[PDB]
Swiss-Prot record, chains A, B:
Belongs to the tryptophan dimethylallyltransferase family. The keyword Hydrolase applies. Dimethylallyl diphosphate binds at residues 111, 199, 201, 269, 271, 353, 355, 419, 423. Pathway: Mycotoxin biosynthesis. Brevianamide F binds at residues 92, 100, 203. It comes from Aspergillus fumigatus (strain ATCC MYA-4609 / CBS 101355 / FGSC A1100 / Af293). It catalyses: brevianamide F + dimethylallyl diphosphate = tryprostatin B + diphosphate; an N-terminal L-tryptophanyl-L-alpha-aminoacyl-[peptide] + H2O = an N-terminal L-alpha-aminoacyl-[peptide] + L-tryptophan. This is Tryprostatin B synthase ftmPT1. The record marks 113 as: Required for regioselectivity. GO terms for biological process: proteolysis; verruculogen biosynthetic process. Keywords: Aminopeptidase, Hydrolase, Prenyltransferase, Protease, Transferase, Virulence. It comes from the Eukaryota. Its EC number is 2.5.1.106, 3.4.11.17. InterPro entries: Aro_prenylTrfase, Aro_prenylTrfase_DMATS, DMATS-type_fun.
Amino acid sequence: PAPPDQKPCHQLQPAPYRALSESILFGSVDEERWWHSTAPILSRLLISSNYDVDVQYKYLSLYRHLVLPALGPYPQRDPETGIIATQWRSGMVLTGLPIEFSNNVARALIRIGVDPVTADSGTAQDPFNTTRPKVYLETAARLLPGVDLTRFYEFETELVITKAEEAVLQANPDLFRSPWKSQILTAMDLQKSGTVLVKAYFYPQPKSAVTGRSTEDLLVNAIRKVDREGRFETQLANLQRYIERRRRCSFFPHFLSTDLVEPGKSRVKFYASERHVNLQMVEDIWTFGGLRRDPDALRGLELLRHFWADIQMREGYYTMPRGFCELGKSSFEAPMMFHFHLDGSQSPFPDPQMYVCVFGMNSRKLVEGLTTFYRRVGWEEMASHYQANFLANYPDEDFEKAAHLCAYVSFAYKNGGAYVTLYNHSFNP
Amino acid sequence: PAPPDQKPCHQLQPAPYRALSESILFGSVDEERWWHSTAPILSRLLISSNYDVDVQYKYLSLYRHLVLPALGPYPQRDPETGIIATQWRSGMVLTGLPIEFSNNVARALIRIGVDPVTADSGTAQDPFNTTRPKVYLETAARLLPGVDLTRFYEFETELVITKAEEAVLQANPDLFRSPWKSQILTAMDLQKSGTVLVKAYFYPQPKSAVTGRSTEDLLVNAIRKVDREGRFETQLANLQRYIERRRRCSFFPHFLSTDLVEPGKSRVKFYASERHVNLQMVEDIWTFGGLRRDPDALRGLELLRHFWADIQMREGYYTMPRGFCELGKSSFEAPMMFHFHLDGSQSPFPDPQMYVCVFGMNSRKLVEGLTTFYRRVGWEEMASHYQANFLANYPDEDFEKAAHLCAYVSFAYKNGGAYVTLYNHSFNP
Ligand SMILES: O=C1N[C@@H](Cc2c[nH]c3ccccc23)C(=O)N2CCC[C@@H]12
Ligand SMILES: O=C1N[C@@H](Cc2c[nH]c3ccccc23)C(=O)N2CCC[C@@H]12
Ligand SMILES: CC(C)=CCSP(=O)(O)OP(=O)(O)O
Ligand SMILES: CC(C)=CCSP(=O)(O)OP(=O)(O)O
Ligand SMILES: [Cl-]
Ligand SMILES: [Cl-]
Ligand SMILES: [Cl-]
Ligand SMILES: [Cl-]
């Protein structure tokens, strides 16, 4: 795999952000304030990732038209405590913001994570945010080519609560006490060509609470019922057997995601979170208890050990946090995560990808450690320029204390090479 | 004056038009259809005029946000006659469309002429379109820097009908039988820097009908009352004396326009239309009956005679047309026009600029004649490329018969050089 592009871009107001800012009439104060707090970051990310200028303008305009109205009310600041937060605490980011730009620094690709909300999201009128994410994906579908919602509707029927089930949770609040109430999250992959690849994520914990069925059973039955051809069957069964092995438990099945394209050629990812955050546990998961030890699998594990050591990952046993850590309060530990890529290929085991929660760790120190890894795998442009670009996104900030600028970092081994993505703070007040 | 830039651009779908088209969510079918019928033309014009890419995107986005909603209902086509037209017949273009892109081919600058309308414009609810142009200019004012509405409000008070005066015209339709009902028109000059220069035009013929005051008296008293400092006094008086001379009549005072900037440093243009369209009449107007014959004035007149002969202007006596010539019916004669630039300078006479109505003349033949003039004044890039660019704006068209693609051509002598602007059809069904 060729090394990723990385151009420096530290401008407070990138040219494309200015050109659009001077031309847009907003019909909402919220949209206008969201734009100015997040558009500069997105514009820098696209310039540093070396997207074409035409494509930069397409995606910033798309951000303006499609995303801004889906962000709902602009976050409000507490005069006393100084905590900046929205009413709806999104399960997409530990800050609780409905927007996140992630950076695939292996390919120099940018993705827009969005949790579509309204003014009523979280209140008594819409306590689990059931409708708006669907409307968002329907709007995206009509606008963007190749977006097939077939997979979304099938998983939505099976993993999202109905009107009747919602009334039960409203009438009996004690049945679901978790602050993480997002059922559906979204992501748009921004390709270099101009094509946008849309993904949906389903968190069935509310459905699990009402129906009395575990998260594992909800996800597996969902995947199995949707998989008419039986393409995911072998890999799903061996994942179940690994989950069965770990049960006989810190390995928790959590959620899934699906690409929105041709159903017979679409792929599902199964996510689980692990509490024991150490390299011994990682090998066990990465190799399925030693069953998956082919050359590609082992070479990936060896590079994972370097990645782990370079970023100075602190090992420990971490549970799911008590609550959110909003922008303003002190930063923190949480469980690591793994997705398993049900790719429908010939392989017996689904492709694993590790996510480590770095929220709580010094962000400047993490990126310096990441630079060490960039030099290890020979990503010259990225090693030289990424750090200065990451920090440039947060001008008025103390990097000596800031531990919220990167929440998660992901690691996978694809096509004989490291695949790394940073999930970063995407908001400047 | 340096020669104008002109790059070739014949693409059916220019890149910036595509990038935005693939990213915009329209809240109106009308806006969406206007965009696709006019945005390709604007994008080509900006590329051929050699605007920077950042500035292209600013102005296309500005077009989308500010202009599209001001165009009102998309034009409808008669199934039998094939005539495509809007309910409101705008006095800005002989086709009756509320949008026109003009090309200052002397400087390679593009201007957006707009007649802001709504669904109610022309009907019994708003028969003279009084409110929407004001709202448009107020919206533009807040969005765009340097836009001072002081001149607009003063001329609006004096030249636009009040609510009471409107009721009189509604109650008695025979008091104003003219199809040209636009009182306020607008224009945005697109500078190369990114700055937009906004202008307002006031046609006081409805005010003249109700108040019983002539168009001449309405305009002059307006200019004189607004001109507190007395900067326009000398030039206005000598224009009045020329109008007085011509009265003792085919020279008709018609309307005025004003830039929207610092009031004490803003400039007014006085427009009059002439029925006798011949070179002998042009010299008389251009020289104020022989009073203005300084070297700059005479050199300009000599070049005007070449311009006149190159485009093959047919001489004659032409009155104001009986009605509009909408897109679909056969093309035609009409009076020529002159603006007089009350510049507030030391000069005794205001700077004249000629407008010739070329609507009715073969547009391909006119542009070929214009190319001859471009070669005469040494505009090499413009001579080589303009014709192919003009025609590229109308793909599915018979140029053998088409006489509506250019409505007016303007001529002035500025800074020892020819100043030419084409006012062109800006719509593709
Ligand atoms: O903040 C969270 N993020 C997601 C994953 C994610 C990160 N970036 C995303 C972008 C799109 C979809 C999902 C994600 C999640 O599952 N979490 C469980 C614990 C904390 C919480
Ligand atoms: O079609 C017309 N155009 C304007 C001038 C104009 C041309 N392009 C413009 C752009 C902005 C403002 C004014 C204009 C006008 O005064 N006319 C009188 C006779 C026909 C009618
Ligand atoms: C950060 C978390 C938990 C999930 C995001 S998965 P993603 O869609 O960003 O990763 P891919 O593009 O599928 O490799
Ligand atoms: C075509 C007619 C009658 C008027 C337009 S005047 P304009 O504002 O386009 O010309 P300038 O930019 O003032 O020289
Ligand atoms: Cl339902
Ligand atoms: Cl640390
Ligand atoms: Cl009034
Ligand atoms: Cl002819």
